[PDB]
Amino acid sequence: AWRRDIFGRIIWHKFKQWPIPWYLNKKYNRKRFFAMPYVERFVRMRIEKQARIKARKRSLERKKEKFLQEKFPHL
Amino acid sequence: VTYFSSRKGKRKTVKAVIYRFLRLHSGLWLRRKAGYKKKLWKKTAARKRRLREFVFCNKTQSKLLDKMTTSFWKRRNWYADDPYQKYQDRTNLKV
Amino acid sequence: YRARPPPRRSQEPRWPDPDDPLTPRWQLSPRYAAKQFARHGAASGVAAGSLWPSQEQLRELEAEEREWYPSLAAMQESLRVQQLAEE
Amino acid sequence: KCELPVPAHRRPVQAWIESLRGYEQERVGLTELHPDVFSTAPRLDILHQVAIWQKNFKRISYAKTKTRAEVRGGGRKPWVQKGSGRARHGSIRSPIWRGGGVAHGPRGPTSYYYMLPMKVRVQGLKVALTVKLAQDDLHIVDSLELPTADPQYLIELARYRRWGDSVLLVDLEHEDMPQNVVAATSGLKTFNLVPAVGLNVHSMLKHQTLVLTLPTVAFLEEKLLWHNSRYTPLYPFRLPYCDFP
Amino acid sequence: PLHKVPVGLWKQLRLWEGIYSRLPRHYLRSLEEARTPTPVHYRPHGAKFKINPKNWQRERVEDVPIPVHYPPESQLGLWGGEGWV
Amino acid sequence: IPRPPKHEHYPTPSGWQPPRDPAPSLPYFVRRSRMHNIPVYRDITHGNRQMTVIRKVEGDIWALQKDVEDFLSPLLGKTPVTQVNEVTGTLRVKGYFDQQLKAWLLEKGF
Amino acid sequence: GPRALDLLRALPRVSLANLKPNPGSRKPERRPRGRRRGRKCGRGHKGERQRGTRPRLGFEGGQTPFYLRIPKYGFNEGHSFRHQYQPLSLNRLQYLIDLGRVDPTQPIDLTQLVNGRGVTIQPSKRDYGVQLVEEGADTFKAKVNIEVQMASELAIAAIEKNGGVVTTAFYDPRSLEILCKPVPFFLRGQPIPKRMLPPEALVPYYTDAKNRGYLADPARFPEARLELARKYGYVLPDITKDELFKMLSTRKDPRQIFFGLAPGWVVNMADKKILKPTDENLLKYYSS
Amino acid sequence: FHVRVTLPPRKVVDRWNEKRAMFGVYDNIGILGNFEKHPKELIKGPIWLRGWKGNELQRCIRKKRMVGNRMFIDDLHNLNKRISYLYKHFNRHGKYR
RNA sequence: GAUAGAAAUUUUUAUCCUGACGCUAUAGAGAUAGUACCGUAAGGGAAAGAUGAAAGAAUAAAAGUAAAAAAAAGCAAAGAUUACCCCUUCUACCUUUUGCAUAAUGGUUUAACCAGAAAAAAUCUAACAAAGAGAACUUUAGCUAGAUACCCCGAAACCA
Ligand SMILES: [Mg+2]
Ligand SMILES: [Mg+2]
Ligand SMILES: [Mg+2]
Ligand SMILES: [Mg+2]
Ligand SMILES: [Mg+2]
Ligand SMILES: [Mg+2]
Ligand SMILES: [Mg+2]
Ligand SMILES: [Mg+2]
Ligand SMILES: [Mg+2]
Ligand SMILES: [Mg+2]
Ligand SMILES: [Mg+2]
Ligand SMILES: [Mg+2]
Ligand SMILES: [Mg+2]
Ligand SMILES: [Mg+2]
Ligand SMILES: [Mg+2]
Ligand SMILES: [Mg+2]
Ligand SMILES: [Mg+2]
Ligand SMILES: [Mg+2]
Ligand SMILES: [Mg+2]
Ligand SMILES: [Mg+2]
Ligand SMILES: [Mg+2]
Ligand SMILES: [Mg+2]
Ligand SMILES: [Mg+2]
Ligand SMILES: [Mg+2]
Ligand SMILES: [Mg+2]
Ligand SMILES: [Mg+2]
Ligand SMILES: [Mg+2]
* Cβ < 7 Å from strand I, D residues 117-176: 117-121, 123
Contact between G195 and G171 (Cβ < 8 Å): yes
Q: Provide the b/e sequence for H46-59 (b: ≥16 CB within 10 Å).
A: bebbeeeebeebbb
Nearest to D203, CA basis, from G214, A43, H26, G111 = H26
D76 alpha carbon – ligand 2 mean position (Å): 6
Q: In the PDB record, what is the listed experimental method?
A: cryo-EM
Three-state SS for E49? Answer: strand
Contact between F100 and F75 (Cβ < 8 Å): yes
Q: How many CA atoms lie within 13 A of H63 on its CB side?
A: 26
Least Cα separation, residue E83 to chain A (angstroms): 22
Q: Helix count (H) and strand count (E) of chain E?
A: 2, 2
Query: Which domain CATH number covers D200?
Result: 3.40.1370.10
Residue F32 belongs to domain spanning:
1-110
Amino acid letter, residue D90: G
Considering every ligand atom shown, identify the ligand nearest to the alpha carbon of residue H2 and give its number.
Answer: 14
Strand order from edge to edge, sheet including B21-23:
B21-23, B29-32, B54-56
DSSP-assigned letter for residue C25: S
Measured CA to CA, the distance from residue D119 to residue F105 in angstroms comes to: 26
- Kindly give, in sequence order, each residue whose CB lies less than 8 Å from that of residue G37, ignoring residues fewer than 6 positions away: G30, G31
Residue C31 belongs to domain spanning:
1-87
Contact between F69 and F79 (Cβ < 8 Å): yes
Helices H73-92, A39-71: axis angle to 10 degrees equals: 90
* Cβ < 7 Å from strand I, B residues 68-87: 70-72, 74-76
The gap from C-alpha D163 to its chain's centroid, in whole angstroms, comes to 21
Burial of D54 (0-12, 13-18, 19+ CB in 10 A): buried
A63 alpha carbon – ligand 12 mean position (Å): 10
Measured CA to CA, the distance from residue B31 to residue B40 in angstroms comes to: 20
To the nearest 10°, the Cα dihedral for G254, G258, G260, G261?
-80
C-beta atoms surrounding G257 within 10 Å: 23
What is the DSSP code string of G21-48?
PPTTSSPPP--S-HHHH-SSTTS-SSTT
Burial of C7 (0-12, 13-18, 19+ CB in 10 A): middle
Considering every ligand atom shown, identify the ligand nearest to the alpha carbon of residue F44 and give its number.
Answer: 6
What are the structural domain ranges in chain G?
A: 81-288
Measured CA to CA, the distance from residue D37 to residue D228 in angstroms comes to: 11
Question: Which nucleotides in chain I lie less than 7 Å from some protein C-beta?
Answer: 1-23, 26-31, 34, 44-47, 59, 61-62, 95-97, 111-142, 144-156
D182 alpha carbon – ligand 15 mean position (Å): 87
Q: How many domains does chain D have?
A: 1
What is the DSSP code string of D147-175?
S-S-HHHHHHHHHHTT--S-EEEEES-SS
Measured CA to CA, the distance from residue F36 to residue F12 in angstroms comes to: 14
The C residues from 27 to 86 touching E (CB cutoff 8 Å) are 64, 68
Closest nucleotide relative to residue G30's CA, C1' based: I148
Measured CA to CA, the distance from residue C77 to residue B14 in angstroms comes to: 43
Strands (E), F4-103: 28-30, 40-45, 49-54, 57-59, 82-85, 90-94
Nearest to D184, CA basis, from D153, D155, D149 = D149
* E-H contacts at Cβ under 8 angstroms: 15
Tell me which chains share at least 3 CB pairs under 8 Å with chain C. Answer: D, E, G, H
Round to a whole number and report the distance in Å from the CA of D86 to the C1' of I106: 13
Greatest Cα-to-Cα distance within chain B, rounded to the nearest angstrom: 52
Q: Test E12 with C22 for CB contact under 8 angstroms.
A: no
Closest nucleotide relative to residue G87's CA, C1' based: I140
Burial of H73 (0-12, 13-18, 19+ CB in 10 A): middle
Query: Resolution in A, one decimal?
Result: 3.8
Q: How many domains does chain F have?
A: 1
Q: Kind and range of the H or E element at G57?
A: none
Nearest to C23, CA basis, from E5, G96, G47 = E5
Chain C contact set for D185 (CB, 8 A): 1-2
* Cβ < 7 Å from strand I, D residues 34-73: 45-46, 55-56, 59, 61-66, 68, 71-73
H79 alpha carbon – ligand 4 mean position (Å): 23
Q: How many domains does chain H have?
A: 1
Residue D59 belongs to domain spanning:
1-245
* Cβ < 7 Å from strand I, B residues 51-70: 66-67, 70
Note if the bond before C70 is cis, omega within 30 degrees: no
